[PDB]
A paper describes a structure:
Unc5 receptors consist of two extracellular immunoglobulin domains (Ig1–2), two extracellular thrombospondin-like domains (TSP1–2), a single transmembrane helix, and a C-terminal intracellular supramodule, which contains a ZO-1/Unc5 (ZU5), an Unc5/PIDD/Ankyrin (UPA), and a death domain (DD). In agreement with previous findings (Verschueren et al., 2020), we show that Unc5 receptors directly and functionally interact with the morphogen receptor glypican-3 (GPC3). All glypicans share a similar architecture: a structured N-terminal extracellular core domain, followed by a C-terminal linker region of ∼80 amino acids (Kim et al., 2011).
To produce complex crystals, we mixed hGPC3core, mGPC3core or murine GPC3 residues 31–488 (mGPC3488) with Rattus norvegicus Unc5D residues 32–307 (rUnc5DIgIgTSP). The complexes crystallized in two different space groups with different crystal packing. Strikingly, all three datasets revealed an octameric assembly. The center of the octamer is formed by four Unc5D molecules that are aligned in a “head-to-tail” antiparallel bundle. Two GPC3 molecules wrap around each end of the Unc5 tetramer. Each GPC3 chain interacts with three Unc5 chains, forming interfaces with the Ig1/Ig2 domains of two Unc5 molecules, and with a TSP1 domain of a third Unc5 molecule. Interface 1 is located at the C lobe of GPC3 and interfaces with the Ig1 and Ig2 domains of Unc5D, burying a surface of ∼690 Å2 (mGPC3 complex) or ∼640 Å2 (hGPC3 complex). The largest interface, 2, is formed between the Unc5D TSP1/Ig2 domains and the M lobe of GPC3, burying ∼1440 Å2 (mGPC3 complex) or ∼1330 Å2 (hGPC3 complex) of protein surface. The buried surface is ∼390 Å2 (mGPC3 complex) or ∼360 Å2 (hGPC3 complex). Within the octameric arrangement, the antiparallel Unc5D chains also form interactions between themselves, especially at the Ig2 domains: the buried surface amounts to ∼900 Å2 and ∼840 Å2 for the major antiparallel packing interactions within the Unc5 bundle.
Numbering used by the authors:
A (entry chain E): 154 to 301
B (entry chain C): 61 to 185, 191 to 307, 314 to 348, 382 to 433, 455 to 476
Amino acid sequence: YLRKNFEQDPQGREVPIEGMIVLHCRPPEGVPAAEVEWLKNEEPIDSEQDENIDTRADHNLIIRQARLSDSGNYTCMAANIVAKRRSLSATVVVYVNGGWSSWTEWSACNVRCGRGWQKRSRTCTNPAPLNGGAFCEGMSVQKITCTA
Amino acid sequence: LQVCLPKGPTCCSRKMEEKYQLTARLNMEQLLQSASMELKFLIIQNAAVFQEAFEIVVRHAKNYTNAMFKNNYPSLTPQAFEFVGEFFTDVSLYILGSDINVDDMVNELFDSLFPVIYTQMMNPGLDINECLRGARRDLKVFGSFPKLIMTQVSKSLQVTRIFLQALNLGIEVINTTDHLKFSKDCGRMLTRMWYCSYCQGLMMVKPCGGYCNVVMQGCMAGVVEIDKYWREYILSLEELVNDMENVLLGLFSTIHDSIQYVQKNGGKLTTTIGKLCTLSSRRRELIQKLKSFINFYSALPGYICSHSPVAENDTLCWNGQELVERYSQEPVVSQIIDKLKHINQLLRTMS
Ligand SMILES: *[C@@H]1O[C@H](CO)[C@@H](O)[C@H](O)[C@H]1NC(C)=O
Ligand SMILES: *[C@@H]1O[C@H](CO)[C@@H](O)[C@H](O)[C@H]1NC(C)=O
Ligand SMILES: *[C@@H]1O[C@H](CO)[C@@H](O)[C@H](O)[C@H]1NC(C)=O
Ligand SMILES: *[C@H]1O[C@H](CO)[C@@H](O)[C@H](O)[C@@H]1O
């Protein structure tokens, strides 16, 4: 006998580019023991194909770096001699935080005599936000008054 | 010693070998930066200009909407300024990559706009506000205008958002290139090619062109693999440029026509409610200048050898260990390729 209700469905997670995430899965009660298989976007994943992904004896999908295994709808599926059962798909999205760039050089004073301007740019590219990452916090331009 | 193969005696110790290794690191980083500087400054300039230009467009469109409200519907001010400011603030927040729902922007705009229209224009004379907000959507008072604006602005704002993120990620990968750390074996090979001749007492001897070729094709085996994805990135950006200024600037006319449309059925509406309650030039020049750097990753080892001191003739040259008459003969790169694949899929889908 194989049950419909999964003991513990995989949870969707937000993980940075370097973060590591473990997707837990407890198959439903059944004799014999349910064979857990992971499917990324309704397609099976090969643990031997990549060092970053490995399948554990206790049905867990561990990802060390969010680079070698990017976002997707990971779904846990239990197979048995009776039938197969699909768990609730976890929406794993890898999010990249905004990071400030160095202060560029000060521009020349536009006005030759009297009140002038000097600019310094600061772009949000180290690192640039990805897959809806938080944008850089604060100002992007710096302006100072100069007297030539 | 661990780098300089000692064939005879040697004029340098192990610490001088470490100094030569660090100078080799600095020379490689300087050469890569010099190779990448023109492209980096091109993309930085364009990113800055497009960002400021989009912010100027959004500010000017908010200004024009506020001015047309001041001129045509003074009865709706100053509440009109609040919801217009909130709408265009959410517009800018969406452009800069924040999680904003475009349909929700338009729906909150019309939800805030309808009650003041009813109280000041249709039925002159705070607690009943939510009943009006519900009746706005339940009776479809604005007709197809909200969905028209919804699609009109979502289509342009999505392409603009992804354009800015693509420019920023290109800046990111180009900044990574000259900061690409290499293997230790490559460090020792570059130290041998550039400096280990000094340990053998030679003053002006340069390494062989062929030795530079084997060394560079040795440690750039991973970096050259980026070329496919960089080419696909360039071509997908070209696919995307072939839009947001016209839409945001006609928003005021569209809103005015929607207000006229609602006022057109005021007779039935009031009784029922009383009862119930130079940009395109820039992106073209950017793409035409960016296509000149499509060979950037494939021509990079050729650049390093053609800009490093080498004996092109392969005669009386340094082969890494002795003066010869003739020469005999991932992780960070993986991240670059991951982000390029991501941005390329994102680009191609907007097409
Ligand atoms: C994952 O679930 C979402 C729910 O909106 C759906 O849009 C999407 O098609 C699914 N798969 C992928 C590839 O995004
Ligand atoms: C709107 O445009 C007019 C035109 O002169 C200007 O006087 C006014 O300051 C502008 N308002 C805003 C908020 O930009
Ligand atoms: C690369 O980004 C880093 C941020 O720390 C910055 O220090 C550096 O100046 C940038 N690169 C170039 C080549 O200008
Ligand atoms: C950029 O701004 C400051 C450094 O000046 C920090 O709060 C942080 O590292 C941010 O990304």
